[PDB]
Amino acid sequence: SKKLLFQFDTDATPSVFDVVVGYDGGADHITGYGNVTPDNVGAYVDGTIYTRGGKEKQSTAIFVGGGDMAAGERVFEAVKKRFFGPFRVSCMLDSNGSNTTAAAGVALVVKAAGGSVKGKKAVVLAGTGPVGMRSAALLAGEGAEVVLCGRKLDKAQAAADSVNKRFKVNVTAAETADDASRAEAVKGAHFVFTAGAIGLELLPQAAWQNESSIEIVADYNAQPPLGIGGIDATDKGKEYGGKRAFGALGIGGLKLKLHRACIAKLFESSEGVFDAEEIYKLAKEMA
Amino acid sequence: SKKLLFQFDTDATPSVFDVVVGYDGGADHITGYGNVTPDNVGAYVDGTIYTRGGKEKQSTAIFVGGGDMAAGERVFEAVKKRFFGPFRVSCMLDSNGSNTTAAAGVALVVKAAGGSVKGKKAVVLAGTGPVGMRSAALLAGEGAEVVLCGRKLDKAQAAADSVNKRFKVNVTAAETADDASRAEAVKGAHFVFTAGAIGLELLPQAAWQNESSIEIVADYNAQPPLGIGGIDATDKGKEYGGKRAFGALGIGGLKLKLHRACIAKLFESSEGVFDAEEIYKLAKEMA
Amino acid sequence: SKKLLFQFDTDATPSVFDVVVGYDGGADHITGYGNVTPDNVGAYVDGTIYTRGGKEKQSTAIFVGGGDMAAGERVFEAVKKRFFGPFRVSCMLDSNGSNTTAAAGVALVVKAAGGSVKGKKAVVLAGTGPVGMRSAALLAGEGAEVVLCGRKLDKAQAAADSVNKRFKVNVTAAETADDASRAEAVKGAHFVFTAGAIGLELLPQAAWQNESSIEIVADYNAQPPLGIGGIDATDKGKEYGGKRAFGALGIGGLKLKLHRACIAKLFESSEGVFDAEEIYKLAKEMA
Numbered sequence: 033s034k035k036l037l038f039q040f041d042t043d044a045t046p047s048v049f050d051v052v053v054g055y056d057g058g059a060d061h062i063t064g065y066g067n068v069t070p071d072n073v074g075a076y077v078d079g080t081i082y083t084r085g086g087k088e089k090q091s092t093a094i095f096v097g098g099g100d101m102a103a104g105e106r107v108f109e110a111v112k113k114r115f116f117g118p119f120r121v122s123c124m125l126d127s128n129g130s131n132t133t134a135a136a137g138v139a140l141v142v143k144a145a146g147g148s149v150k151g152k153k154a155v156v157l158a159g160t161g162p163v164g165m166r167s168a169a170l171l172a173g174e175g176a177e178v179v180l181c182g183r184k185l186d187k188a189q190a191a192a193d194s195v196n197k198r199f200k201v202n203v204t205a206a207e208t209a210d211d212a213s214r215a216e217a218v219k220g221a222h223f224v225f226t227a228g229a230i231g232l233e234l235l236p237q238a239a240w241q242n243e244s245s246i247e248i249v250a251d252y253n254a255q256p257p258l259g260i261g262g263i264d265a266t267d268k269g270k271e272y273g274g275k276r277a278f279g280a281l282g283i284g285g286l287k288l289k290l291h292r293a294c295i296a297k298l299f300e301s302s303e304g305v306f307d308a309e310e311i312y313k314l315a316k317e318m319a
Numbered sequence: 320s321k322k323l324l325f326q327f328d329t330d331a332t333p334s335v336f337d338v339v340v341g342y343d344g345g346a347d348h349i350t351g352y353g354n355v356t357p358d359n360v361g362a363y364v365d366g367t368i369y370t371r372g373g374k375e376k377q378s379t380a381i382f383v384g385g386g387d388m389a390a391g392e393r394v395f396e397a398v399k400k401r402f403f404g405p406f407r408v409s410c411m412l413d414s415n416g417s418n419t420t421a422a423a424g425v426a427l428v429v430k431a432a433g434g435s436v437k438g439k440k441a442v443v444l445a446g447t448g449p450v451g452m453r454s455a456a457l458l459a460g461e462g463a464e465v466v467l468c469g470r471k472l473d474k475a476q477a478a479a480d481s482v483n484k485r486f487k488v489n490v491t492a493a494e495t496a497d498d499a500s501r502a503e504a505v506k507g508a509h510f511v512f513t514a515g516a517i518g519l520e521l522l523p524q525a526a527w528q529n530e531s532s533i534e535i536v537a538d539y540n541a542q543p544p545l546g547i548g549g550i551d552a553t554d555k556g557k558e559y560g561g562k563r564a565f566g567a568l569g570i571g572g573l574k575l576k577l578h579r580a581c582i583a584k585l586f587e588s589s590e591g592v593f594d595a596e597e598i599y600k601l602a603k604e605m606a
Numbered sequence: 607s608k609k610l611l612f613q614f615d616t617d618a619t620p621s622v623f624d625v626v627v628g629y630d631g632g633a634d635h636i637t638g639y640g641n642v643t644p645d646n647v648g649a650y651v652d653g654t655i656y657t658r659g660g661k662e663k664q665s666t667a668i669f670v671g672g673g674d675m676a677a678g679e680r681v682f683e684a685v686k687k688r689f690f691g692p693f694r695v696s697c698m699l700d701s702n703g704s705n706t707t708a709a710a711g712v713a714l715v716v717k718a719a720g721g722s723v724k725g726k727k728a729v730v731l732a733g734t735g736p737v738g739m740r741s742a743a744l745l746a747g748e749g750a751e752v753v754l755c756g757r758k759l760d761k762a763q764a765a766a767d768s769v770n771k772r773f774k775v776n777v778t779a780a781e782t783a784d785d786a787s788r789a790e791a792v793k794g795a796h797f798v799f800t801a802g803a804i805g806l807e808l809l810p811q812a813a814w815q816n817e818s819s820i821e822i823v824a825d826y827n828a829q830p831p832l833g834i835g836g837i838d839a840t841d842k843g844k845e846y847g848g849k850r851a852f853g854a855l856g857i858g859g860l861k862l863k864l865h866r867a868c869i870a871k872l873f874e875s876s877e878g879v880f881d882a883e884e885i886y887k888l889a890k891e892m893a
């Protein structure tokens with residue numbers, strides 16, 4: 033049977049980026065839908081579970097995407113709720129590539145760290161967006177003491193509460209309104225991630241270079257000025273007098289390979305569920 | 320040339336069910352459109368008839384679907400009306416699966432009856448919907464005496480008139496507003512079909528198992544309480560005393576293979592027209 | 607990698623005609639979007655330039671189409687504007703088949719004229735539409751002396767100004783408000799093209815067959831009354847006395863083959879820009 037991927041996007045039209053990667057990952061055909069909601073996705077799912085049987089079923093799979101993570105999460109939950117008994121197919125969630133980007137970034141840092149980050153302090157700057165929250169979640173799951181920062185304490189605390197409930201961890205928040213506060217929050221930390229919006233700087237070279245404790249820095253922003261000063265986007269473990277760095281493009285290379293590999297995995301079984309935990313498990317096997 | 324199927328759906332977005340079946344039927348690519356109407360479909364059809372010539376033409380085809388049978392029929396007529404001379408391609412109509420469902424059901428019953436039902440009495444309970452109407456048409460074309468029943472003579476006689484004019488047959492109507500009247504209507508019948516809306520019982524175990532004249536019963540409702548009591552939805556010719564029963568899922572298994580086979584036929588010529596009659600002819604071959 | 611074509615149509619839904627030709631031109635997959643504007647196309651383009659690298663870049667391409675040429679040009683310019691450095695893919699513009707139609711027409715006439723029209727006079731009747739304007743541009747590029755006519759001088763001059771600025775040529779405009787003026791305008795001309803709206807006659811038989819200077823005539827209107835009287839739409843170099851005629855269908859046959867061949871070119875490099883000039887270059891090779 034041909035491998036058919038059904039793309040459910042919460043935005044008005046399906047993401048072009050997700051279509052290309054889906055095909056390069058092995059889909060024979062991709063059929064996409066926009067404006068997908070928790071109320072209209074059930075009928076679409078029925079079409080994937082009552083049309084093929086047995087080993088044929090694994091050749092159909094579902095991918096959920098779009099620009100708003102919370103919206104994708106509501107659709108993803110409604111998809112899983114429609115399945116019942118043996119009537120199911122594999123599914124994946126990766127709105128705006130946040131799960132694959134956060135998983136690639138954390139896997140690279142944990143590997144470069146020797147394989148463990150337990151008990152160590154980790155700081156995610158501008159960690160209130162989807163990549164920062166998923167990054168905080170995966171680090172916390174690895175045992176690190178995570179502090180999620182943002183300009184305003186309420187938003188920062190809301191993000192940690194959200195992450196804590198979903199992944200059952202205990203991330204703490206902190207307000208850092210300026211570069212100065214951001215320099216302080218970083219003191220005593222062993223790992224520092226900058227998950228800021230595109231084209232903004234958050235931690236100049238001084239701010240991280242003179243902190244004996246810092247082992248690794250990782251930046252998700254690929255547009256200059258970069259989130260971390262003193263490094264290049266292509267950096268991928270590059271040495272900087274003690275500290276090692278991973279730039280956005282070095283992280284991006286793995287994210288792309290990871291996304292492709294997850295798509296292929298969707299067709300090897302009819303019961304895969306790929307959200308942050310499972311995507312990160314695969315990321316560690318590929319880093 | 321690649322086998323290209325153009326899917327025209329009357330609902331807001333195209334049916335996922337119809338997409339999977341189309342690829343398993345052999346289409347190389349399926350391009351779908353939602354909110355298709357009798358007015359906008361003409362321009363879509365031009366794209367299928369003026370882009371390929373000669374032997375190439377049979378490699379493009381059209382499929383009309385959606386949840387409303389009436390809307391689908393209006394669009395299908397607009398499609399056939401657009402063709403002119405040699406400028407045409409094969410087309411199929413199967414809104415809400417009404418044609419393939421009714422064709423599989425009748426084909427299975429006629430086969431289990433020995434191959435001929437000429438002159439026998441067949442009763443279709445709640446036969447005023449698309450599935451009941453198409454079933455009555457096909458039975459009447461096979462020569463059976465058909466009585467289409469519903470809660471109000473008004474609507475039942477209109478359903479019968481519609482079928483009679485479209486298929487050139489002579490189905491009669493009858494009013495059965497309650498259990499008792501329903502049980503009464505099946506006396507003396509050889510074949511009984513329940514084509515009621517989903518989740519409703521129309522013929523309890525005690526209304527058919529004690530009528531000697533009845534040879535075969537068939538139910539299209541797959542949601543408990545089933546249309547026929549005393550059987551399982553998966554029954555496919557299972558014997559109950561001296562009678563045989565077909566459950567909605569037993570019928571559905573053939574409906575799926577039939578729907579796949581019809582799509583493949585669309586690419587074997589550029590003049591095929593697959594509506595109830597032709598879909599039924601193929602159903603008999605495969606039953 | 608699979609050859610992926612992304613279709614951006616300015617209308618509500620993507621053209622069926624453009625999809626079929628795109629597959630016959632060699633695309634492995636076509637993903638179409640409707641309602642595309644200069645504003646929302648940027649995010650779409652990003653998806654085609656950040657998902658593949660190196661030799662895989664050329665396996666993704668863009669096609670802009672739809673019914674309104676002006677809307678299409680705006681989107682096409684926005685697409686080229688999003689590219690930067692090596693981050694780009696091949697792209698093509700053919701809203702309403704205006705580029706492939708004008709290129710096929712001019713190529714056929716130039717070949718029939720011995721391969722050169724330099725220094726000769728070409729008149730384009732009702733040349734204010736997109737087909738008429740593109741035809742005038744290619745003819746002027748061949749060194750012909752071109753006169754673009756229309757019922758009102760201001761509109762005709764605006765058309766020539768547009769063409770002259772865009773292709774850097776020097777087409778002249780003239781007002782021909784009635785039958786008498788159109789007949790006067792072609793006296794002494796060597797080539798006459800009728801690019802009027804569908805179903806209108808612009809050049810009666812007696813208005814061209816008695817003019818000794820006229821060598822070849824071409825008509826883009828396929829709906830009777832044809833733009834040029836006394837010819838058949840299927841004519842493709844048919845001789846009438848000392849003259850050759852090309853009708854709308856004779857021209858359309860090359861347009862179709864040309865459109866297919868252009869799509870194939872898009873995947874041969876990641877820098878192709880298929881607008882009128884490059885499409886005409888290929889038309890000459892194929893006429």
Ligand SMILES: NC(=O)c1ccc[n+]([C@@H]2O[C@H](COP(=O)([O-])OP(=O)(O)OC[C@H]3O[C@@H](n4cnc5c(N)ncnc54)[C@H](OP(=O)(O)O)[C@@H]3O)[C@@H](O)[C@H]2O)c1
Nearest residue numbers: 129133158160161162163164182183227228229230252253
């Ligand atoms: N290439 C890929 O495949 C890919 C995929 C996904 C993401 N990414 C990249 O990874 C990064 C993370 O994405 P994201 O979507 O999670 O980010 P986001 O939601 O756009 O922004 C992250 C946070 O940055 C903070 N911020 C915004 N403007 C700021 C300013 N002027 N000063 C200080 N803080 C500011 C906000 O935190 P507070 O308001 O709490 O301060 C915001 O929650 C982005 O740079 C994005 O480009 C790349």
Ligand SMILES: NC(=O)c1ccc[n+]([C@@H]2O[C@H](COP(=O)([O-])OP(=O)(O)OC[C@H]3O[C@@H](n4cnc5c(N)ncnc54)[C@H](OP(=O)(O)O)[C@@H]3O)[C@@H](O)[C@H]2O)c1
Nearest residue numbers: 415416445447448449450451469470514515516517539540
């Ligand atoms: N799995 C598939 O591929 C597939 C495809 C199509 C259909 N189906 C199933 O097959 C059946 C037929 O579909 P359909 O669309 O023709 O049905 P429908 O139009 O939904 O219903 C059929 C008839 O049921 C009668 N009815 C409604 N409520 C009733 C009640 N409370 N008591 C008695 N009669 C009642 C009505 O007739 P009166 O008003 O005249 O009494 C109505 O015309 C359904 O169960 C449907 O789920 C399955």
Ligand SMILES: NC(=O)c1ccc[n+]([C@@H]2O[C@H](COP(=O)([O-])OP(=O)(O)OC[C@H]3O[C@@H](n4cnc5c(N)ncnc54)[C@H](OP(=O)(O)O)[C@@H]3O)[C@@H](O)[C@H]2O)c1
Nearest residue numbers: 702703732734735736737738756757801802803804826827
């Ligand atoms: N088969 C294909 O692939 C294909 C594709 C595209 C176009 N075409 C055909 O080629 C032709 C050119 O298309 P187009 O889009 O450029 O045309 P258009 O924009 O529809 O019309 C061209 C010009 O015709 C003139 N006109 C309109 N009504 C007129 C009338 N009643 N009397 C005299 N002149 C009138 C107008 O010029 P003024 O107002 O300046 O006088 C108008 O600008 C059409 O016949 C079309 O069907 C075929």
